[PDB]
Every structure is written in structure tokens, then in C-alpha cells.
Structure 1
Amino acid sequence: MKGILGVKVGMTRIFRDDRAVPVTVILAGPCPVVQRRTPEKDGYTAVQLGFLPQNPKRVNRPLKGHFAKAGVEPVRILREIRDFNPEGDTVTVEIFKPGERVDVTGTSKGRGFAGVMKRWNFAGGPDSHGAHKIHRHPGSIGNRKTPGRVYKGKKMAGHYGAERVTVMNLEVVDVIPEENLLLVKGAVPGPNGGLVIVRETKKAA
């Protein structure tokens, strides 16, 4: 179930078959598999997949040269791939052919305390007529004596954004192995320079 880590680089249009193709260039660098963990001593199947190299030994003792190729532990080994057993070593952009759909998981841009209406697309109040200090307010939040309380999931204002988000079934417009670049078209979450993980699609699986 091929997966790979990477950083959202940017967006741009492509042109193909005399057609504009809006895409999001993600860099899916070589991912040194550092652990596997099978139903033997884990109960499932995955692949620790350390990403960006870096670390002039800000690595301390929790380092794992245990699995040979630690090639100086990477900044974010974080996240396995679950039910993926690679070409033995080092996973790269090669796992993706132009024309495959993919599921990108990202960390959506944060908006902090966002009001109902944005958080939730509420209509708020009228900007004129009666009006009165309730223009962007949520209105009523309940009934009367029964139930005499607010529902468990009542859509209200709160922190919104900066969360796990997975835009699904994205076309792979192109892949450039020379530079570990991968071009999906459109809507990958989070900011540029944020970390994402690209996976096989779930439309087929």
C-alpha cells in the first residue's frame, strides 16, 4: 500500500494536451526505512520512514543505528505507512507512475480561535435593520426547559485549523525522480514547507 513522506513545495500550472493543469509540487525525498514491525512483535504491518536528513547530532541517545541505514537519523522519522512492505530498502518517488491517484495527508493551516461562521459557515445576523451587536453571532443554541441543555457536538466557535486533513484521490500529473519531485494536481493541505505523506488511493486499494 505504497506510502511516502514529503514537503509541500508550492503550486503552479502545467499545460498538457493544450490544457491548463493546476498542480501542487510535493518533494517526496528518499525515505530510509528504519523499522518495519510485523505481526510478529507488533500485530500489524508498517514501515518507519525517516525523512529529511539533517541533524548535526541533535540526535541524542534515543538514536537507532540498530537498523543499519540510519544515515544520520532524520528530523522526522515520524509516521509509518501501514500494510506497506517496500522494495526492501529506501522508498522514493519511483513508486508512483503518472496517472495514479493518491491520497495526501497534511496539516491544515491554523486559524486559531475562529468564530462560528468560518469555523462552520453560519449565516450570522443581519448587518442592518434590527441589528444590534449580533452580526457574526451563532443565534440560538438550544430550546427551552426540555432538554434544558446543549447537544454534545454543538457547532460553536473554537480553535479551527492546524489539524490532520487528507484530500483524497488526487491525480499524479507527473514525477521527476532526478530531484525527488512529485506533481499532484490541486488541493494538498497545510502551508508550504509543511510535512505531508502521500499514499495509494482508497478508491481501489
Structure 2
Amino acid sequence: MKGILGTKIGMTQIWKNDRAIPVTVVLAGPCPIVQRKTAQTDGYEAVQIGYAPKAERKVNKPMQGHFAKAGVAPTRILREFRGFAPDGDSVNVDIFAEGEKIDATGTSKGKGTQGVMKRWNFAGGPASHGSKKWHRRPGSIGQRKTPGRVYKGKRMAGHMGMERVTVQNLEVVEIRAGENLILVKGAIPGANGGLVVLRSAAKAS
């Protein structure tokens, strides 16, 4: 249900009680509400929400027009949510509590054109027994005269990375209201300064 947008700032050490908890700092800047998607007026229930602030000199006339309807301030990023529909704007306070589990999603770092050993784990071949197919290079791709063809959606070299990724059940260690900061036990995908979306625990234990 509820959630917000922020920036991955980094990972650091942090003891809680008597144990060393690795955490990942996230800036959940205040998020304005720019549009209310009513199912009646649209077709589904949702809320549009903005993040990084932009200079009006950089904002398209149309986009300015959009922002004027609610009249907050031009922002660089907009996204939507579900079942979320409160009043005012979207600060992580009251939203997330320390101890609550959360689904943290973002765009991974991408690795470009990675082989199969990297991409799909694979296993490649013997490095000593006399080859020409060391490191990677896959084995075969099919069978033979039967379906003389390779299966749709199979394991080959490709673009690894740049994917939407959602990690589930992360613990909210600490929350600094006013500094608009939040700490999350463990690692979140994507790079520092990356966009992250922190959503309520969807289907949890």
C-alpha cells in the first residue's frame, strides 16, 4: 500500500543493542502529491507523487501546467502508488515505523554485455585439458534434427543489469524525522544517488 521515493545514499556500520547491523541510508525527501487518480475519473485508484526538485527554467510549459493543477512546485520525478490516499504531502514520518518490514525497489547497476558465466552462472569449460573454449563460451544450444531451433527465452549472452528490482522484507532500523533519513538493514539494489521506492510490506510473513 503506502510508500515513498528517495535516494540511496550509502551503507555503513551501526550497532543496535549488542550486535553489528549493516544498514543502507536512504533519503526519503518530502514527496508532494501532484495528482489523485480516482478510479471514477480514471479507472483505478492511485496517487502520483513527486521527488527531486527542479528549476522552473528547466521545466516544460506543459509540465508546468501539470504542476499548476495542485500547485506545489516543479519536481523532476513523478511516480504512482496504490491504496495510498492521505491529505497534505508525503513525508516518511507517520508512514514508516522503526521495526516495520518494507519492500525496497530500485534500478540495479547494469553490467552491460556480460557473458553467461556472469549472466546466468553457467560454468564454461576446462582451462587446461586442451581447449579453445576456456572461460565462457556455452556448450550446445539444443538437440539435433529435432526442433532444429533454440528455445524461446533461453540462456545466452545479453545485457545484464539495469533491471527493476524489489527486495522484500527489510527491517526499518532507525528513522530520523526532520532529516528526512531512513536506515534499512541490509542492501538495496542500484547505485548511490540512485532512485529507490520504499513500499509498505506487500505480502509478508
- Is the TM value for this pair above 0.5? yes
Aligned letter for 1:145? K
Structure 1 unaligned spans of 5+:
none
The equivalent residue for 1:89 is 88
Provide the rounded CA distance (Å) in 2 between the counterparts of 1:147 and 1:133: 25
**Does the CA-based 8 Å contact 2:5-2:51 persist in structure 1?**
yes
Residue 56 of structure 1: CA displacement? 4.0
> Could you tell me which residue of structure 2 aligns to residue 154 of structure 1?
154
Aligned position for 2:183: 183
Q: Which amino acid aligns with 2:162?
A: A
Amino acid of the structure 2 residue aligned with 1:47: V
CA–CA separation in structure 2 for the residues paired with 1:187 and 1:138? 31
- What CA distance in whole angstroms lies between the structure 1 residues aligned with 2:121 and 2:67? 50
**Which protein has the bigger strand share?**
2
Give ranges in structure 2 of 5+ residues lacking alignment. none
Structure 1 residue aligned with 2:75: 74
Residue in structure 2 matched with residue 111 of structure 1 by the alignment: 111
- Aligned residue for 2:45? 45
Q: Does 1:4 align with 2:4?
A: yes
Asked whether the 8 Å contact 1:44–1:82 carries over to 2, the reply is: no
Report the aligned-residue RMSD: 1.4
Percent of paired sites with the same residue:
61
- Whether 2:145 is the aligned partner of 1:145: answer yes
TM-score by length of 2: 0.94
Instruction: Name the CA distance, whole Å, in 2 between partners of 1:51 and 1:171.
Output: 23
TM-score, with normalisation over the residues of structure 1?
Answer: 0.94
Instruction: Specify the code of the residue in structure 2 equivalent to 1:92.
Output: V
Give the letter aligned to residue 92 of structure 2. V
Residues 32 and 69, structure 1, Cα contact 8 Å, conserved in 2 = no
Matched residues in 2 for 1:156 and 1:147: separation? 18
Q: Give the number of aligned pairs.
A: 202
